[PDB]
Curated annotation (Swiss-Prot):
Induction: Exhibits enhanced expression in matured epithelial layers. Apical leptin, Staphylococcus aureus alpha-toxin and Pseudomonas aeruginosa acyl-homoserine lactone 3O-C12-HSl lower expression levels, altering junctional integrity in intestinal cells. Residues 70-230 form the Guanylate kinase-like domain. Interacts with occludin OCLN, claudins and TPJ1. Interacts with PATJ. Interacts with UBN1. Interacts with FASLG. Interacts with CCND1. The chain holds residues 476 to 772 of 919 of the full protein. This is Tight junction protein ZO-3. Residues 1-61 form the SH3 domain. It comes from the Eukaryota. Belongs to the MAGUK family. Phosphorylated. It comes from Homo sapiens (Human). TJP1, TJP2, and TJP3 are closely related scaffolding proteins that link tight junction (TJ) transmembrane proteins such as claudins, junctional adhesion molecules, and occludin to the actin cytoskeleton. The tight junction acts to limit movement of substances through the paracellular space and as a boundary between the compositionally distinct apical and basolateral plasma membrane domains of epithelial and endothelial cells. Binds and recruits PATJ to tight junctions where it connects and stabilizes apical and lateral components of tight junctions.
Length: 241
């Protein structure tokens, strides 16, 4: 047989063929102890190898449960996901949340809702709740999110699959200029924000669905932004088969 599978328990790599996985990873199982291939955010096949069959998989999961006595295990329970979940690709039947990362999340989010109140609303955070995002997607709008990598992994896990856009700053000066021009009254460290972007790029790259170079003070990055949201909104995402 052949199909796509999503894994809901942890497994360590194993020499030479055995593949390791984490809650949320997806495998194109080529043949059925199963021959499988990992699927990256690219949707392009990556490491080829071996993975446990349904039966061994169920045991390995029961085991990992008993051993209990960004960790996503509470969601696997609250979601009632099985060790293996057969998935297929479909275009989202809802407007996908949009996560803006980088030193202009605030500017980007204000301009979007100001220009298009009917397609965008900022998700209100105090701590972010899924229901907040759900309520906004129900109004048929993109929920705009300013959140951590951890938040992003949770949304990916429950299959809201945000569009994640990271903005790359030229330099601390170049960013201070940009901010002074687009957020004149803003009182926030051009310094804390630049270093934050560096931290995100270093360790969080894997969660980005797009990056966009901040290269001046013109509307270009904002233009590319808008095009990228409308495009990736048509791209097929994983969903339960």
């Amino acid at each position: 047989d052949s199909f796509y599978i999503r894994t809901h328990f942890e497994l360590e790599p194993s020499p030479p063929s055995g593949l390791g996985f984490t809650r949320g990873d997806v495998f194109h199982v080529l043949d059925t102890h199963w021959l499988a291939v990992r699927m990256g955010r690219d949707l392009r096949e990556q490491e080829r190898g071996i993975i446990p069959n349904q039966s061994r998989a169920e045991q390995l999961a029961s085991l990992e449960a008993a051993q209990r006595a960004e960790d996503l295990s509470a969601l696997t329970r609250q979601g009632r996901y099985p060790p293996y979940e057969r998935v297929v690709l479909r275009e989202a039947s809802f407007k996908r949340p949009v996560v803006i990362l980088g030193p202009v999340a605030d500017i980007a989010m204000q301009k979007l809702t100001a220009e298009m109140p009917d397609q965008f609303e900022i998700a209100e955070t105090v701590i972010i709740k899924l229901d907040t995002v759900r309520v906004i997607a129900e109004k048929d709008k993109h929920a705009l999110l300013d959140v951590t990598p951890s938040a992003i992994e949770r949304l990916n896990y429950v299959q809201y699959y945000p569009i994640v856009v990271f903005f790359i700053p030229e330099s601390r000066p170049a960013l201070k200029a940009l901010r002074q021009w687009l957020a004149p009254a803003s009182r926030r460290s051009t310094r804390r924000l630049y270093a934050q972007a560096q931290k995100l790029r270093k360790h969080s790259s894997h969660l980005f669905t797009a990056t966009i170079p901040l290269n001046g003070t013109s509307d270009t990055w904002y233009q590319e932004l808008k095009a990228i949201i409308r495009e990736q909104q048509t791209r097929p995402i994983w969903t339960a088969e």
